[PDB]
C-alpha cells in the first residue's frame, strides 16, 4: 500500500544491479495503473512532503528488478526514468540532474511550453509580419532548444528505455527542431508549426470538454490499425499501375499536327524551336481557351483530328506534364487518383480519346474493384477502431464508478402569473405557434429574385405579423415560468434567442430566421419512429462536436504550414500557373486561402490544386504535404464521422394524443348534439383447360423462351441511334420484330390469366409491371395501326419503350434479392428524407436571401470573359454596350439561388462536390442585384459554403448511409442471420469458401525413398526455399517497374534477358517441386496456381515474340505482355495481411455480382431514355464529339462516368438550355428530320438527379454493407 515510498539512494541502485547480475548468472507486464502519465492510486494516499518531486524508487514490481527511478509531482503524476547515467554523466543523485527533473516533472513548464506554441501558431497565421517580429522567431528557437535539454538532462537521449527519443511525440519534436536548424541556412520553408499537434495530446486527456478522449484515441488507433490495408492498397495500385503502364505508355503524347509545313520544316526542325503556347498553337490543334493540345488516336474509336492535321506522338503530356502513364511513378499517381476518384473523369476521357473507347474496360475494372473495395476497406477498419475505443472507454469508466460507490402589490402580480399559465397549454397554445412557424417558413420560401415592390412589401408585413406574434408569446411564458425556470430548459433558450434577434432587426441578420423550423421537431415526439431517429441524432450530437473541434484544429495547423512552405512561391512564380500573372482562385499565400485549399483536400479534391503547387514549389514537398493532409483528413477523420454515426445507431408526454382525445370528445359530442337538435326540429372442362395452361406456363421451356424474348426485345432497342437512317434493312426488320414481340407478350399475359386467375395475377407486383408494359405496347400498336399516330403525345408513349428491359428484372433471382433488400429499406429512407429536407430548406432559404439575382454578369460572348466593373458597372451600362457593340450579354448562371428549388439544385451540386466551384466563385464575387460582380468582393461567403458542407455532406449523406446499413442488419436479424444479398445457390458456394478459409491441418507429403529425390525434397520443403523465391519475385517486380517511355534499345534488350533468366528460374523451381513432391504436388491449390502461371509465362513470351516478328499488331503485343503480371501475383501467398484481405473480397464476389447485374439493367434503361431525349443537344460543356448520347456505346460510357457522380453537372448543363439566346429551336441536323438543339430542363433534371440517387442507394450503400460484413468474417 502507501507505506511503500522511498528515496532511491545509491544503495537501492546497487541492490537493483546485484539482482540483474544474479539474473544474468541464472541465465511480465506492469501495472497499467501505475503505468506512466497516470495518477498515483488513492490506495497510496498522500505523499510525504519530502518525497514529492524527488528521485524515488520504482513501485511497479515488473521493473523493480530492471534499472529505473520514478518521480511524482504535486499532482500524483507518475513519471518513469532511467537510472543509467545520462550520456554516461548525470546520475539521479547528481544535483544537476535533480534540477532538470524538478523542472521537467512540474506543471508550469508544460503550461508555458503550450502557451509558447499557441502564440507562435497565431503569429504565423500572419502573411507579412512586421520587421520587428522576426527576432521573435529566433526567440522561439532557444526555448525549444532549452526544451530538448531539460528532458535529455533528465532521462537521456535514445540508448536506454525510458528516454527522450523513445516517445513518438518526441520524435516529432526532434524533426521540427533539426528541420529549423537546417532551414536557417537552406532555401526550405518553416515547419515550426507542426509541433502544435501536441494540443492533440492535450485533448487526449482534457476533462472540461467531455469525450475529446474517445475521438483523439480513436484517431490514433485507426492510424495504427490501417497498416495491412495500406500494404494491400500499395500492392493493388502497383499491379494496376503496371497494367496501365503496359497499355497506355506514351498515349497521352498524341497530338494533331499540321500536314503542310511551309518552308522545308519537319516535325523535328520545328519542335526544336517551339517555346510558348502561341507558337505551339500554330502547328498543333488546340481547342478554344485550352492549355493543352487536343489529344487524338490511331483507332476508329479514338478522337479525331480536324482535316489538315495528322495524329502524332510528340511533345509533353497534359496538365503541365503530370498526367501520363509513361513511367511507373506517374502511373502510380494516376492509379491513386483513380482510387480516390479525384477528377478521374478527365483522365477517363483523355485516356479514351488517346487510346480508344474500347479501353473503358480498364476503368470499369479499376473503378469498381479497386476504388470501391479499397475505400470501403479503409472505412471498415476505421469503423472497427472507433467502436473498440468507445467500448473500452465506456467500460473503463464503469469500473471506476462501480469501485467508487462500492467503497462509498405582489399578490396582484401573482394573480396575473397564474392567469397567464392557465391559458398556456400544449394542445391549444403550443400547437398554434408551431403551425405559425411553418406558415412563416412557407412565406419566407416564397421569395424569389424577379420580384415586384408590392409582393416584397406584402411579405414584409407578413414578417412583421409573425415576429410580433412570437415576441408576444415569449413574454407570456417568461412571466408564468420565471427567469430562473426558463433557462433550465435547453429548448426554451433556443426560443428566446430567435425572438430577441428578430427584434434587433425590427428596431444581414435576417438569414437567421429559418432556424425556427428546427422547433417543428417537438412534434416528432408524437410519431414514434421519427422520434427514435431524432433521439439517435441527439445522442450523436456531442461526439459530432468534439470531432468538429479536432477537424478544425487539424485544418488550421496544416494551413499555417502551407502558407509558410509554399506561400511566397505562389507570388514569385505566379506567371507559371496563371497567364495574367495574378494569383489563381485557389492558392496558399494567405491564411484564408490556405485554409480553403486544405478544406478542399479534406473534401476529396487534391490534384488540381497540387498541379499548381508542384509547378511553383517543386514536386517532392508538395507531394509530401498533400499526402499527409489527404491521409489524416480524408481517410481517417471523415471515416470517423461516419464511424461515430454508425456506432450511435446500434447502442441500445405525448400531448398530441391528449389533443386527439379532446377532439374525439368535441367532434363526436357536437355532431351528436346537432343530430339531437335536428330530431327536435322534425363436367370440369374449364378447370381442365385451366390446369393445362398452368402446366404450360410453369415449364422451364416456356420460362427460358420468354427470357430469351425479353433479352432480344431489350437488345433491339439499342439500335435506334442517330445512324438509324443509314441502316435501312435493319430498321425495317426491327419494326416487324417489334410486331411479333408484342404478339408473344400478349399471348403470355392471356396464358397467365387463364392459368393463374385474375385475383392471383392482379395481387402480384411483377405481373402488374408486365401488364403495364404490355398495355403501353398494345396502345401504341393500335394507334400506329388506326392511322392517327404521331399525334404529339404518342411519341411520349414511344419513349416508354425504354421501360421494356424492366421485364428482365422479375426473371433473375440475383436482381430480385437486391431489389427486395432495397424495398425493405425504403420506409426508413423516407423518415430521414424528411429531416434532411427540413435542414436543406433552411439552408436554401438562406442562400436565396444571400444570393438571389446577384449572379448576373456582362460577359463577352467571344471569349466568355467578364467585363471589368470599371467599364461595365451595372446592367444599364451592359445594355448600353449591347447597343453599340455586339458580342455582349447580361447572362445569369444556370444553377443559381434565384428561388428555393434552384437553391435545392445548387445545394445538391455543392454537397456532391460537382459544379460547386462556379457557384462559389459567383457567390464570392456578388455585389448586388443589378451590379457587375467584382473579383472576390464577398470573400467570406465561403463560410456559408463551408458550414453547409459540414451539415449537408458530412452529416446528411452519412446519416442516409447509417440508417440504410442499420435496416439491412435488422433484415438479416429477422431472417435469422441469413444473407440478404445472395441467392439460394450462391449461399451454398459461400458456405464452401469459409471452409476453404478455415485453417485445417494438412496431411504430410511423404519423403520419397530415392536418395536423390529425397535430397530434392529436403531442399524444396525447407522454408528458406520459399523465402528465396519471394525475394526473386520482388526483384522481378522491380525489373518490371523500371520500364519507361522512350527507353533505349540497350535497355529493352537487357530487361528482356533479365526476364528470361527469371522465367528460367521459376520454371526450374516448379520442375524441382514436381519431382520431389511427385503426384502430391497438384493436391495444393497454390501449387496449381504456380504451375498455371509458369505455363502462361513461357507461352506468353513465345507468342509475343511471334506477334511482334511475323505479324505487326501492336495492341495484341501489348495485351499479351500482361501475362507477366501473373508472376507478381504470387507475392500474395507469403503475405498474410494481403491474403486475408483478398479473401474477404473473394467471399464478397457473389453478392457483388447481383449488384452489378441490377446496375447494368438500370444503366441500360437510362441509356435508352438518353438516346431518345438528349441525342440532339448543343454539345457545350460535358457533351462533346465522343462523350454524348448519340449511340448506345457513348450513352453507356457517360452513364458509367456519372455512376460515381463525376461530371453530372457537366452532362446536365447543356440540357438546361431552352431559350433562343442559348439554343436554336429550328436547327437542321443533316441526315435526320429532327429540328432543334434545345434541351428539356425538367426531363434533364429528373434524369440526372434520379440517376445519381439510384447509384447512391444501389451501388454505394450496398457495396458498403457487403464489405462491412465480409471484412469482419475474414478478419475473424
Amino acid at each position: 500500500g502507501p507505506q511503500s515510498f522511498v528515496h532511491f539512494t545509491k544503495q537501492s541502485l546497487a541492490l537493483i544491479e546485484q539482482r540483474i547480475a544474479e539474473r544474468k548468472s541464472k541465465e511480465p507486464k506492469p501495472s497499467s495503473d501505475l503505468e506512466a502519465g497516470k495518477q498515483l492510486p488513492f490506495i497510496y494516499g498522500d505523499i510525504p512532503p519530502g518525497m514529492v518531486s524527488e528521485p524515488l524508487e520504482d513501485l511497479d514490481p515488473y521493473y523493480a528488478d530492471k534499472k529505473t527511478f520514478i518521480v511524482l509531482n504535486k499532482g500524483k503524476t507518475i513519471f518513469r526514468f532511467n537510472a543509467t547515467p545520462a550520456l554516461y554523466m548525470l546520475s539521479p543523485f547528481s544535483p544537476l540532474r535533480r534540477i532538470s527533473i524538478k523542472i521537467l516533472v512540474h506543471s508550469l513548464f508544460s503550461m508555458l511550453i503550450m502557451c509558447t506554441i499557441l502564440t507562435n501558431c497565431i503569429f504565423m497565421t500572419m502573411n507579412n509580419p512586421p520587421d520587428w517580429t522576426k527576432n521573435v522567431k529566433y526567440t522561439f528557437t532557444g526555448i525549444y532548444t532549452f526544451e530538448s535539454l531539460v528532458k535529455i538532462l533528465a532521462r537521456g537521449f535514445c540508448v536506454g528505455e525510458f528516454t527522450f527519443l523513445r516517445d513518438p511525440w518526441n520524435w516529432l519534436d526532434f524533426v521540427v527542431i533539426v528541420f529549423a536548424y537546417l532551414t536557417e541556412f537552406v532555401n526550405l520553408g518553416n515547419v515550426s508549426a507542426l509541433r502544435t499537434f501536441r494540443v492533440l495530446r492535450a485533448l487526449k486527456t482534457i476533462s472540461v470538454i467531455p469525450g475529446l478522449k474517445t475521438i483523439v484515441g480513436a484517431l490514433i488507433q485507426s492510424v495504427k490499425k490501417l497498416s495491412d490495408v495500406m500494404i494491400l492498397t500499395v500492392f493493388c495500385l502497383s499491379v494496376f499501375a503496371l497494367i496501365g503502364l503496359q497499355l497506355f505508355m506514351g498515349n497521352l503524347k498524341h497530338k494533331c499536327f499540321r500536314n503542310s509545313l511551309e518552308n522545308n520544316e519537319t516535325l523535328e526542325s520545328i519542335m526544336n524551336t517551339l517555346e510558348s503556347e502561341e507558337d505551339f498553337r500554330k502547328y498543333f490543334y488546340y481547342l478554344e481557351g485550352s492549355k493543352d493540345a487536343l489529344l487524338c488516336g490511331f483507332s476508329t474509336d479514338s478522337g479525331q483530328c480536324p482535316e489538315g492535321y495528322t495524329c502524332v506522338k510528340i511533345g509533353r503530356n497534359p496538365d503541365y506534364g503530370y498526367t501520363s502513364f509513361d513511367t511507373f511513378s506517374w502511373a502510380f499517381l494516376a492509379l491513386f487518383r483513380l482510387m480516390t476518384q479525384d477528377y478521374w473523369e478527365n483522365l477517363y476521357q483523355q485516356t479514351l480519346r488517346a487510346a480508344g473507347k474500347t479501353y473503358m474496360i480498364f476503368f470499369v475494372v479499376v473503378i469498381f474493384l479497386g476504388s470501391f473495395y479499397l475505400i470501403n476497406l479503409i472505412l471498415a477498419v476505421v469503423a472497427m477502431a472507433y467502436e473498440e475505443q468507445n467500448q473500452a472507454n465506456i467500460e473503463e469508466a464503469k469500473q471506476k464508478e462501480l469501485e467508487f460507490q462500492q467503497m462509498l402589490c405582489s399578490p396582484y402580480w401573482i394573480k396575473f402569473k397564474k392567469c397567464i399559465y392557465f391559458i398556456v397549454m400544449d394542445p391549444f397554445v403550443d400547437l398554434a405557434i408551431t403551425i405559425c412557424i411553418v406558415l412563416n417558413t412557407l412565406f419566407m420560401a416564397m421569395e424569389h429574385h424577379p420580384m415586384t415592390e408590392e409582393f416584397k412589401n406584402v411579405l414584409a408585413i407578413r414578417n412583421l405579423v409573425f415576429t410580433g406574434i412570437f415576441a408576444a408569446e415569449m413574454v407570456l411564458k417568461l412571466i408564468a415560468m420565471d427567469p430562473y425556470e426558463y433557462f433550465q430548459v435547453g429548448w426554451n433558450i433556443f426560443d428566446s434567442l430567435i425572438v430577441t434577434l428578430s427584434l434587433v432587426e425590427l428596431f444581414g441578420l435576417s438569414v437567421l430566421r429559418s432556424f425556427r423550423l428546427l422547433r417543428v421537431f417537438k412534434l416528432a415526439k408524437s410519431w414514434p419512429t421519427l422520434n427514435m431517429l431524432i433521439k439517435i441524432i441527439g445522442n450523436s450530437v456531442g461526439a459530432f462536436g468534439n470531432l468538429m473541434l479536432v477537424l478544425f484544429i487539424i485544418v488550421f495547423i496544416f494551413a499555417v504550414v502551407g502558407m509558410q512552405l509554399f506561400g511566397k512561391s505562389y507570388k514569385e512564380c505566379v506567371c507559371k500557373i496563371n497567364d495574367d500573372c495574378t494569383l489563381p482562385r485557389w492558392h496558399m499565400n494567405d491564411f484564408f486561402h490556405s485554409f480553403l485549399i486544405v478544406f478542399r483536400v479534406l473534401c476529396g479534391e487534391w490534384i488540381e490544386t497540387m498541379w499548381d503547387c508542384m509547378e511553383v514549389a517543386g514536386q517532392a514537398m508538395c507531394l509530401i504535404f498533400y499526402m499527409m493532409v489527404f491521409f489524416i483528413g480524408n481517410l481517417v477523420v471523415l471515416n470517423l464521422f461516419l464511424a461515430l454515426l454508425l456506432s450511435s445507431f446500434s447502442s441500445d408526454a405525448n400531448n398530441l394524443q391528449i389533443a386527439v382525445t379532446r377532439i374525439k370528445k368535441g367532434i363526436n359530442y357536437v355532431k351528436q348534439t346537432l343530430r339531437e337538435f335536428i330530431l327536435k326540429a322534425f363436367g370440369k372442362i374449364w378447370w381442365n383447360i385451366r390446369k393445362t395452361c398452368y402446366k404450360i406456363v410453369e415449364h422451364s421451356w416456356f420460362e427460358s423462351f420468354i427470357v430469351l424474348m425479353i433479352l432480344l426485345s431489350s437488345g433491339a432497342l439499342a439500335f435506334e441511334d442517330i445512324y438509324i437512317e443509314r441502316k435501312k434493312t435493319i430498321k425495317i426488320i426491327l419494326e416487324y420484330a417489334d410486331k411479333i414481340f408484342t404478339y408473344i407478350f400478349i399471348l403470355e399475359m392471356l396464358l397467365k390469366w387463364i392459368a393463374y386467375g385474375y385475383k392471383t395475377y392482379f395481387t402480384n407486383a411483377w405481373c402488374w409491371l408486365d401488364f403495364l408494359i404490355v398495355d403501353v405496347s398494345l396502345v401504341t400498336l393500335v394507334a400506329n395501326t388506326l392511322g392517327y399516330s404521331d399525334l404529339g403525345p404518342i411519341k411520349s408513349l414511344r419513349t416508354l419503350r425504354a421501360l421494356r428491359p424492366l421485364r428482365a428484372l422479375s426473371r433473375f433471382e440475383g436482381m430480385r434479392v437486391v431489389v427486395n433488400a432495397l424495398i425493405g429499406a425504403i420506409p426508413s429512407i423516407m423518415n430521414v428524407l424528411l429531416v434532411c429536407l427540413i435542414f436543406w430548406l433552411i439552408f436554401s432559404i438562406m442562400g436565396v436571401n444571400l444570393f438571389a439575382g446577384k449572379f448576373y454578369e456582362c460577359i463577352n460572348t467571344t471569349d466568355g470573359s467578364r467585363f471589368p466593373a470599371s467599364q461595365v458597372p451595372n446592367r444599364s451600362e451592359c445594355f448600353a454596350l449591347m447597343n453599340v457593340s455586339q458580342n455582349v450579354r447580361w447572362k445569369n448562371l444556370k444553377v443559381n439561388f434565384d428561388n428555393v428549388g434552384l437553391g435545392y439544385l445548387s445545394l445538391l451540386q455543392v454537397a456532391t462536390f460537382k459544379g460547386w466551384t462556379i457557384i462559389m466563385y459567383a457567390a464570392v464575387d456578388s455585389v448586388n442585384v443589378d451590379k457587375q460582380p467584382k473579383y472576390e468582393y464577398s470573400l467570406y461567403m465561403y463560410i456559408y459554403f463551408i458550414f453547409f458542407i459540414i451539415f449537408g455532406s458530412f452529416f446528411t449523406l452519412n446519416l442516409f448511409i447509417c440508417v440504410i446499413i442499420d435496416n439491412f442488419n435488422q433484415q438479416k436479424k429477422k431472417l435469422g442471420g441469413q444473407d440478404i444479398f445472395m441467392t439460394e445457390e450462391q449461399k451454398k458456394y459461400y458456405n464452401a469458401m469459409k471452409k476453404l478459409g478455415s485453417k485445417k491441418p494438412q496431411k504430410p507429403i511423404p519423403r520419397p525413398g530415392n536418395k536423390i529425390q529425397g535430397c530434392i525434397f529436403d531442399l524444396v520443403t525447407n522454408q528458406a526455399f520459399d523465402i528465396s523465391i519471394m525475394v526473386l519475385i520482388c526483384l522481378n517486380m522491380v525489373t518490371m517497374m523500371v520500364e519507361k517511355e522512350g527507353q533505349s534499345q540497350h535497355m529493352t534488350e537487357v530487361l528482356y534477358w533479365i526476364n528470361v533468366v527469371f522465367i528460367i528460374l521459376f520454371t526450374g523451381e516448379c520442375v524441382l517441386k514436381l519431382i520431389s513432391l511427385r503426384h502430391y504436388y497438384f493436391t495444393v491449390g497454390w501449387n496449381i496456381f504456380d504451375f498455371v502461371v509458369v505455363i502462361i509465362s513461357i507461352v506468353g513470351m513465345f507468342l509475343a515474340d511471334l506477334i511482334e516478328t511475323y505479324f505487326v499488331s501492336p495492341t495484341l503485343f501489348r495485351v499479351i505482355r500482361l501475362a507477366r503480371i501473373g508472376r507478381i501475383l504470387r507475392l500474395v501467398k507469403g503475405a498474410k495481411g494481403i491474403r486475408t484481405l483478398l479473401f474477404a473480397l473473394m467471399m464478397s464476389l457473389p453478392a457483388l455480382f447481383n449488384i452489378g447485374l441490377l446496375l447494368f439493367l438500370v444503366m441500360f434503361i437510362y441509356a435508352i431514355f438518353g438516346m431518345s431525349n438528349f441525342a440532339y443537344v448543343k454539345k457545350e460543356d460535358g457533351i462533346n464529339d465522343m462523350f454524348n448520347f448519340e449511340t448506345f456505346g457513348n450513352s453507356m460510357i457517360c452513364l458509367f462516368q456519372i455512376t460515381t457522380s463525376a461530371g453530372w453537372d457537366g452532362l446536365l448543363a447543356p440540357i438546361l438550355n431552352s431559350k433562343p439566346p442559348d439554343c436554336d429551336p429550328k436547327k437542321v441536323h443533316p441526315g435526320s428530320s429532327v429540328e432543334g438543339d434545345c434541351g428539356n430542363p425538367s426531363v434533364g433534371i429528373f434524369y440526372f438527379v434520379s440517376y445519381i440517387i439510384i447509384s447512391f442507394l444501389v451501388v454505394v450503400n450496398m457495396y458498403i454493407a457487403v464489405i462491412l460484413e465480409n471484412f469482419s468474417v475474414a478478419t475473424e
Binding site: 499540321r258 500536314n259 503542310s260 498553337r281 500554330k282 490543334y285 488546340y286 481547342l287 479525331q304 483530328c305 480536324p306 482535316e307 489538315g308 370440369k684 381442365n688 383447360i689 390446369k691 393445362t692 395452361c693 402446366k695 404450360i696 442517330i722 445512324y723 437512317e725 443509314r726 435501312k728 434493312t729 425495317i732 426488320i733 416487324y736 420484330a737 410486331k739 411479333i740 404478339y743 408473344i744 399471348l747 440532339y1176 454539345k1179 464529339d1185 448519340e1190 437542321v1228 441536323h1229 443533316p1230 441526315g1231 435526320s1232
Partner: protein, 173 residues
C-alpha cells in the same frame, strides 16, 4: 448532328425526287466555307457534264435543257459551311437517269492555317414508271407471318398434347 446518309437510287417518272449528298467535317466545331459542283452523265453515254454550281448563297445552273426549270436546291441554307449539298428534281423525266458526282470543295479556317479539301460522292439512279417495294420489306413481312403461325401452331400443339394427358389423369382419379 451530322449523319452521312446515302441517296436513294429509284426515281418515279412524273414525280419529284431528292438526290442526297451529305459530306460532314471530321470535327464539327471547325469553321469552313464550302461550295459544290454537280455533274451528271446519262445512261448510255461516257462523259460527265457539269449541270450546276452552288456558291455562298445563289445557285447557278448550266444551260442544259434536261435539267433547266426542274432542279431546285434542297440542301443547307443561310451559311457558307454547307454540310448538306442536296438537290431536287421536279417532274422527273427519263433523261435524269445515269451517274451523278457531287463535288464538295471545303476550305477550313484555322489559326494561321487554311486547308483546301475536296470530296466526291457518287450516286447512281434509274427512272421507272412504278415504284417497287424493296425485297427487304417484302421478305420481312412474309417472315413476320411465318413466325406468327408457327408459334401459334406450336403453342396449340403443346396445349392439345398436355390436355389429352391431364384429361386422362382426371378420369384415372
Amino acid at each position: 448532328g451530322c449523319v452521312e446518309v446515302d441517296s436513294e437510287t429509284e426515281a418515279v417518272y412524273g414525280m419529284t425526287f431528292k438526290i442526297l449528298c451529305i459530306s460532314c467535317k471530321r470535327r464539327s466545331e471547325t469553321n469552313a466555307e464550302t461550295f459544290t459542283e454537280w455533274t451528271f452523265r446519262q445512261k448510255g453515254t461516257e462523259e460527265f457534264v457539269k449541270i450546276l454550281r452552288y456558291e455562298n448563297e445563289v445557285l447557278q445552273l448550266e444551260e442544259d435543257e434536261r435539267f433547266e426549270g426542274r432542279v431546285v436546291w434542297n440542301g443547307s441554307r443561310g451559311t457558307k459551311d454547307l454540310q448538306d449539298l442536296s438537290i431536287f428534281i421536279t417532274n422527273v423525266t427519263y433523261n435524269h437517269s445515269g451517274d451523278y458526282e457531287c463535288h464538295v470543295y471545303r476550305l477550313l479556317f484555322f489559326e494561321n492555317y487554311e486547308h483546301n479539301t475536296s470530296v466526291v460522292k457518287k450516286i447512281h439512279i434509274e427512272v421507272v414508271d412504278k415504284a417497287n417495294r424493296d425485297m427487304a420489306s417484302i421478305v420481312s413481312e412474309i417472315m413476320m407471318y411465318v413466325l406468327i403461325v408457327v408459334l401459334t401452331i406450336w403453342l396449340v400443339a403443346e396445349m392439345i398434347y398436355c390436355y389429352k394427358k391431364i384429361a386422362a389423369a382426371t378420369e384415372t382419379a
